């Protein structure tokens, strides 16, 4: 099969788990104009009720089944590239040019597991109000994602940091970028803790 629509369908099957963890589905719903106004509403409710990942699945499932205007697979991908989930944009491209090197994917895949084990220290010793502004210019947070972190920061610092960490790990080259924040931030102790050195 040499059709792009059918190729994109098969490429999801290979990567379906990775993309679900890499897609922020609330923003990407704006640029998906071809999606019916109904399905675009159901997906935003699936975010609220059954978690983001079961929303991205609904987003994906309704993308493949059902025809769309030719050239949508680039509209979808370009949406993901500019709604603060560029790493899923790497995987999603049918021509497969911009797929992160397997050294990168594996190395970050264990970097992500590393943060999960370090959240209790992070949520304690890291404070969002003094890292968000720096995090913006490193270009691993969008205006869309900055507001939520500032919004979640309302009910305590801890809930803010849990939101920041949930958000950076989808950005491209995020671990190296995240460290560049921490060392350029007053949390020079954490970067010792993250990599051990």
């Amino acid at each position: 099969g040499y059709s792009t629509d059918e190729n994109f369908r098969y490429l999801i099957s290979c990567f379906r788990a990775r993309v679900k963890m890499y897609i922020q589905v609330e923003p990407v719903l704006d640029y998906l104009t071809f999606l019916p106004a109904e399905v675009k509403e159901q997906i935003q409710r699936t975010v609220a009720t059954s978690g983001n990942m079961q929303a991205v699945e609904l987003l994906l499932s309704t993308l493949e089944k059902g025809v769309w205007h030719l050239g949508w697979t680039r509209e979808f991908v370009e949406a993901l590239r500019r709604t603060g989930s560029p790493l899923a944009a790497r995987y999603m491209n049918p021509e497969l040019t911009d797929l992160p090197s397997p050294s990168f994917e594996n190395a970050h895949d264990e970097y992500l597991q590393l943060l999960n084990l370090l959240q209790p220290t992070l949520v304690d010793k890291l404070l969002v109000r003094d890292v968000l502004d720096k995090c913006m210019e490193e270009e691993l947070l969008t205006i869309e994602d900055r507001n939520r972190i500032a919004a979640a920061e309302n009910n305590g610092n801890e809930s803010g940091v849990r939101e920041l960490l949930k958000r950076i790990v989808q950005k491209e080259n995020w671990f190296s970028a995240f460290l560049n924040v921490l060392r350029q931030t007053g949390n020079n102790e954490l970067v010792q803790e993250l990599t051990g050195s």
Binding site: C14, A17, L96, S103
Partner: protein, 74 residues
């Protein structure tokens, strides 16, 4: 072992491989059995991209496991 790779078209390619074989080795086996050059092959093991330098044992690829083959097409 004896592992499987699924291509886009659907037909699965069965390989006589053993855990001592690195990913460069298995990618050659695909070429010898199917014909895609190694530089064009990107092998996927359940949503995990396979590094060229490592071996199947590094990825816990047990016997009769499966791989997904994606080709950087035009």
């Amino acid at each position: 072992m004896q592992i499987f790779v699924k291509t886009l078209t659907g037909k699965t390619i069965t390989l006589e491989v053993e855990p001592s074989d690195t990913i460069e080795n298995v990618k050659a086996k695909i070429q010898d059995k199917e014909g895609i050059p190694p530089d064009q092959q990107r092998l996927i093991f359940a949503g995990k991209q396979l590094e060229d330098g490592r071996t199947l044992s590094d990825y816990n690829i047990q016997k009769e496991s499966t791989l997904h083959l994606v080709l950087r097409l035009r």
